[PDB]
């Protein structure tokens, strides 16, 4: 049970420690393996819930800056047990939040960015009261990751959880989307993936250009209010326009991306303690724009239309002309970016970067929890590395963890 | 217990109740998942045997409506004393031919299984040495070929019985390529088959020494050493690749057979191993043009491709390999469909098992599938497949990975 993963490209073996550390659990049973559930499975932590959870925080933490067993170690055992015992929860240091926050990334099995796990700038919001002063920590986060195009790994971390009434939210899915539409007469004008929010928003008092790359507002949520709209400055949300290098017909079709991904809505939990709202962002993997929010079916869908400019057979399947127009797409999205110098990486560097990332993390940590499932990319899957690298996945604290929308528990 | 699984795209959710007729075990536990493991580790006396053949038994007759039956209850007991006097028991040729197609449709790694119900089942049990292996095999690829209007099949060789007289058949497919290590560190032929190629060189095997030359058979009999026979070649039906629109393609000297038969793979029914069952279709085209062609372990052919195309081939940002991973995934489907030899795209293939498996959830209460496995190897989020939540465990009847014959055989000499 000290595990093996095999490189079966490369017959590199590796052998996992790390995993004999893992807390929580997976979902999968001896008889039921669910590696490809999208999402496996009011509870404020109770008193005693709450103090191992915390000390196993400190004990990594300590070990971690070579003070396991030290007088500042117990000390602070010691502080942290006094104030729950007082207080029913506690606060952590500045070091701890920092060491917390890089560490959920690290622990995150499902990225594949993760090999800048340690450059991570983190904002401390822990003082915010307000979604105006929310507003304000989110647009110097913005700013800040942005960097006129040379992007910086951030995450900005608001007031944690306290009774479940008081919660600090990020309504959006990302800071930074765009709106959908649904035609009275036919599907969808925009981005189908944010129909509903699009009209919570218009619901909530938006009034929308209705064009097809429309910046959503940020509907910011403090202690448990109501939430309010913010514009995002225009000149904060750095847009690629995409073209092709070849083809003079693909800047015709009108396309453009934001340079950056800032996922928003997820829960961060450090020592039992819960961030409810805790933006985070880094830069894109070119796929995740071409791949997946270009040609989706249930997205933008622009492969026939593509397709078609490219005069493609698109009678037969076995023709391969969708997966023609995919490599274009994504050729073009990468030529863009690269060509205005935003920050972007192809799925061909990012995961021969993840291979070296698995084995520092096997030699300095004894083990790297992946999830096969989301690293292999969603094209030319085994012209990488990573489709022939076997993989384990366990689920290590701190950790960033998924969180019911908002508008379904809203005690309004 | 019920299950949920749900399609992201359409929002389709279906219910799994089948799990619970699982026995086996996957490899994963509570704290850890090992669905990315490519052979996780998941002699029988009868201790174990009778309650195998029972569960078995109950399963067949329940598919044929006489569960209970007087036929039912008196095969209970027919099996029930054989075992207990021999050890072991045959299958009559009705419960072996629903074992076989049973095995299929549980493969969760297979996404061709929409065909399960018509596969064409050889009985070779009757077979007691390799001469008579190498018959059954011959009629086998005939049948299955079938002039490129390929069929399945399968040929079950005897059973398993104190695994000291097991057959064997030593090659993974019955029709493969040589590969050759060269001293300089190259590879002459196909990567993959080197030591096999070696291990029927050192039987006798006179190699041609080219980058096609199709492999002989080496087959076991009742645990006798394994003996070196050669498919006659015009029953070996291949394909040369050309490219629709590109003609210095076929200057590139491809070619590849068009029938895929698997040999290495354990049967188990009712507690009894056929550890000698080679099975057959027919490609998905991307088993060919992505992973024979493109590996770097295999021909790995993406740069002489990508060059004669004139890519920007100096920044992998350019993605020349994704591009001539295309272009020869084409030429392959392209030079099947025009010899009129059987394939299927991976478009087709992933599209007909979603209506498959909706089809098992229905008539069956569950389907189990390895994303890992039924997702295809390029263009994963645009086939139907990569939305889709699938739950994995095991059923029997099962094929089984076994370990190869060179290392756990005792030589006669
Ligand atoms: C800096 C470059 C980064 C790259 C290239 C990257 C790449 C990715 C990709 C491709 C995914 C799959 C999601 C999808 O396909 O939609 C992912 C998921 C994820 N990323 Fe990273 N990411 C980066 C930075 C970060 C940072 C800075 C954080 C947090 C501090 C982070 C945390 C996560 C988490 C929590 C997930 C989902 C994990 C889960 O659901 O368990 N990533 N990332
Ligand atoms: C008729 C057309 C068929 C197609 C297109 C097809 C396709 C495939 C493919 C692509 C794989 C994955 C192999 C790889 O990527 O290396 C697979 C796995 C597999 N197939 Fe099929 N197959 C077909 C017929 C059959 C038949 C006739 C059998 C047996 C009677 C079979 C049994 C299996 C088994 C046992 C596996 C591995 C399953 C596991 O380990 O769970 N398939 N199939
Ligand atoms: C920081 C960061 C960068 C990046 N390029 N992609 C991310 C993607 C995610 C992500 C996490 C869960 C789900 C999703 C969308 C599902 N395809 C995205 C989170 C963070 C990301
Ligand atoms: C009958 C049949 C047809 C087909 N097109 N592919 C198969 C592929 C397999 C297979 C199963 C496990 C492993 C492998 C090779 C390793 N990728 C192939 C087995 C049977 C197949
Ligand atoms: C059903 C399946 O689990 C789901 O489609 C997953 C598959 N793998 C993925 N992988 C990544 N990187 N991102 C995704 O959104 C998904 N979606
Ligand atoms: C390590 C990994 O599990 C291994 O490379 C698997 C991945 N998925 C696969 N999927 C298919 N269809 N065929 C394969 O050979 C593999 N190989
Ligand atoms: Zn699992």
Sequence with gaps: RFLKVKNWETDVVLTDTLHLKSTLETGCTEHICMGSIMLPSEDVRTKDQLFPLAKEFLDQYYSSIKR???????DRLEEVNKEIE???????????????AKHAWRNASRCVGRIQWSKLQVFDARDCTTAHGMFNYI??????????????????????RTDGKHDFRVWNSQLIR?????????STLGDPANVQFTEICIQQGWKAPRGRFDVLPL???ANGNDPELFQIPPELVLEVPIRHPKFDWFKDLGLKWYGLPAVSNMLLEIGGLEFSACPFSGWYMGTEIGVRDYCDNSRYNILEEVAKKMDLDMRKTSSLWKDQALVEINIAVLYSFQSDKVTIVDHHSATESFIKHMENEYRCRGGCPADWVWIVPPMSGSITPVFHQEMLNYRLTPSFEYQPDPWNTHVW
């Design 68 to 74: 396991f067993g030290s007088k500042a170690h117990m």
């Design 86 to 100: 007082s207080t029913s929860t506690y606060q952590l240091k500045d070091t701890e939040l920092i060491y917390g």
């Design 139 to 160: 647009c110097n986060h913005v700013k800040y990751a942005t960097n006129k195009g040379n992007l910086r790994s951030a995450i900005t971390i608001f007031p944690q």
């Design 178 to 186: 765009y709106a959908g539409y649904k035609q009275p007469d036919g």
């Design 219 to 221: 509907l910011l949520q």
